[PDB]
Design a protein around this ligand. Sequence first.
Ligand SMILES: O=P(O)(O)C(O)(Cc1cnc2ccccn12)P(=O)(O)O
Ligand SMILES: O=P(O)(O)C(O)(Cc1cnc2ccccn12)P(=O)(O)O
Ligand SMILES: [Mg+2]
Ligand SMILES: [Mg+2]
Ligand SMILES: [Mg+2]
Ligand SMILES: [Mg+2]
Ligand SMILES: [Mg+2]
Ligand SMILES: [Mg+2]
Ligand SMILES: [Mg+2]
Ligand SMILES: [Mg+2]
Lengths: 343, 343
Amino acid sequence: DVYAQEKQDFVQHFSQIVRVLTEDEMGHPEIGDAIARLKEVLEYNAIGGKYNRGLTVVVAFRELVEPRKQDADSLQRAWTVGWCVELLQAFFLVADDIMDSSLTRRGQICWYQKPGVGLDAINDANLLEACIYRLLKLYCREQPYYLNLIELFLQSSYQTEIGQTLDLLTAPQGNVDLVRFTEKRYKSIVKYKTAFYSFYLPIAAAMYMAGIDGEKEHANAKKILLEMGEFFQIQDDYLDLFGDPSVTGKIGTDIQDNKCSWLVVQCLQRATPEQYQILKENYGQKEAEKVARVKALYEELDLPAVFLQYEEDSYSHIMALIEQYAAPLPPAVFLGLARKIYK
Amino acid sequence: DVYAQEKQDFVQHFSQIVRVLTEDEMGHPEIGDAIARLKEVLEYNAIGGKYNRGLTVVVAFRELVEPRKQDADSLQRAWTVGWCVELLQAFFLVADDIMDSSLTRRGQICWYQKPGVGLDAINDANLLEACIYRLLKLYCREQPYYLNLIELFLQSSYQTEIGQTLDLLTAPQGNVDLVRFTEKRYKSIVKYKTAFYSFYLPIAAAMYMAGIDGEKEHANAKKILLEMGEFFQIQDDYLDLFGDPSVTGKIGTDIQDNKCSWLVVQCLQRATPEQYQILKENYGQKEAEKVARVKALYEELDLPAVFLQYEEDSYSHIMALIEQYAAPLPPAVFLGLARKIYK
Ligand SMILES: O=P(O)(O)C(O)(Cc1cnc2ccccn12)P(=O)(O)O
Ligand SMILES: O=P(O)(O)C(O)(Cc1cnc2ccccn12)P(=O)(O)O
Ligand SMILES: [Mg+2]
Ligand SMILES: [Mg+2]
Ligand SMILES: [Mg+2]
Ligand SMILES: [Mg+2]
Ligand SMILES: [Mg+2]
Ligand SMILES: [Mg+2]
Ligand SMILES: [Mg+2]
Ligand SMILES: [Mg+2]
């Protein structure tokens, strides 16, 4: 992949990110303990993933910016902005893990589950968020795209938070109403909670850094990226139940948490009234036997096979959107991302 | 007060703030339920306070901007930016109430304690934060001070979050070490957690709106405002134990929560080794009888009288700093604020 060609170098740069964020300390040694906590938080929560969102900024930048304009400082700004995307993810995930009552993330216990962390993780997440704007000021403040990037991160955060609200509102604890789990509702939740920040944000950041600021170009980019994001969230929902946690790094909670998962939507489209009652009886509950019954029902209704077919159809659709909407950007910008997510 | 002269009108404007924030809905009716939740969150959490921070932007604006430049639109931008300060407070308090295990706020149950809210309040707080940047874009994007304000809110949030980290790190649950509760540590915690966002932020916002952007003018302003903020937090700590909750609107938790309160710092400065052991035995614990013992010890050591004296000395000090540092701004800018907090 073009992603493996940039990864080791991207990751390498995290030590610099941490160093520049945790040297607000000469000048202000009274905040030392707080900066030590920030370092711990950064190291626990922004490292251990695949780095695909941050890497996408870097790879897109190199593909959109003329090689004679890819000087040392410009490349550094590019991987800084990719790390800002990673930090945005880190902030959101820390908070999400608490609100979803999750156990593990990236092959370790969730930050909030750590003895001695707990709900202090809320402020830790806010700090991760603040680091984004700190790095943008330190590295990009004199660039013509500075305000574009600040506003792109802010707006992406707002959209994401709106999607989180829909997610949580459609999934009330102890309150099983399957009636709300429609395809239309599903598409809206995932557009807001995932598609903007996971797909549109990183490419858009690289577009703005390359001086591509036009509303038409950004709107065309979105046509591809929001669709890619929807697929990505459907995949996430499928892996929540059917994925191997040694590979995914995380234990699923969607059934217990009463979530408007792609799986439950597809279940409802297919289920006889008898299967509907089974689903109603067992969904949204902590008991392991009830979760098992839901999984059994999904397997009975061939949902893994339905997912496999959906992934093929989706891949073909996204490739079609690249043919329609890529120009004037290099198709490789989107195809690389397609390759990474449809693996 | 100059604050009462602007309050009814300031509060009046909240209906407009809510209307403009909850009409992201024509165009995007798929987010309707989320926008309904945002309205609920806004109404519960940004209304019911004294509005002093938001009001300070408005009053300072009128005192710093030439009356011929105080047109309809400019006044509207001023009360919008004051509401942004209120929203910053609202975001921070929702999160703080969870992390401090608080019960009530502004004479009602804390948002997170509401049946059916719970830890979903984390995302609600993030949404309140997003509304700040939304209102600044909608109302101030074409103004020469736009980036100044965005960066002032972002930086104030970072500082505040650093202060929150110090607060929480100095107050580990179930872990009583009084050794860390020093005056030096106290001053650092409150500078970061309170002084920036409660005092410096609102005046600074009005300064930038009035085209007063000079580093020397902002640095002089800070000399007064950070000191005022320290006093304000000492007052907050005193009222945590000795205030009337029908007046304060909130039930105190500092002793239970093992906080580096001004009260405990002053206790440690004065306490015999026998009183030190009593404090060690009873601090940072949930039992009502142990909290009562700590309060008894404080009363034994005349801490209310010590606070009364401190408030006089502090008032005199801040007035001295106004004489030194107010120019070239009208002294009324600071004196009005002094009047409100030393009441
Ligand atoms: O927990 P994961 O990794 O399975 C999850 O995929 C995480 C996720 C998706 N979108 C957002 C937005 C903000 C915070 C977290 N987000 P989900 O949406 O299923 O919680
Ligand atoms: O709960 P209160 O109102 O007594 C409290 O005064 C609230 C407070 C002060 N400073 C901050 C910063 C962020 C969030 C809340 N903050 P405290 O600092 O004592 O928690
Ligand atoms: Mg989750
Ligand atoms: Mg979630
Ligand atoms: Mg998931
Ligand atoms: Mg879940
Ligand atoms: Mg508190
Ligand atoms: Mg607190
Ligand atoms: Mg307090
Ligand atoms: Mg407390």
